[PDB]
């Protein structure tokens, strides 16, 4: 349900990025953690590149 939650704060996500993050949402990272990671990269789009870099910085394997 991160599509609606990211949209609530004006964040878009690609379908491939949803594939890599949906199962981990609310279990291994918070919406605020993902939003902060995206904002520090100066983007409001969550793509597969940002998703893989996000899971890497968080230590989610």
């Amino acid at each position: 349900m991160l599509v609606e939650d990211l949209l609530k704060n004006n964040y878009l996500i690609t379908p491939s990025a949803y594939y890599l993050l949906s199962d981990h949402y609310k279990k291994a990272f918070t919406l605020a953690e993902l939003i902060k990671f995206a904002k520090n990269r100066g983007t409001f789009v969550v793509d597969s590149n940002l998703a893989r870099e996000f899971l890497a910085e968080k230590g989610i394997i």
């Binding site: 599509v3 949209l7 004006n10 964040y11 878009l12 690609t14 379908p15 949803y18 409001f44």
Partner: protein, 55 residues
């Protein structure tokens, strides 16, 4: 799923909507009918403008 017309002002990959449908990808300058949730977010990011179509 309410939809409106917007001029997407940046390049943009395909993104998911609330209905789990795919929307895009968009070339900078495209005009598309997309769900208002996505369009309003792009408007707030100053990445799109609404366009009214009087029918």
């Amino acid at each position: 799923v309410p939809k409106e017309a917007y001029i997407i002002q940046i390049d943009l990959p395909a993104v998911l909507g609330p209905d789990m449908k795919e929307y895009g990808p968009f070339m900078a300058g495209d005009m598309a009918i997309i769900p208002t949730v996505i369009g309003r977010a792009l408007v707030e990011r100053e990445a799109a403008r609404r366009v009214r179509i009087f029918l």
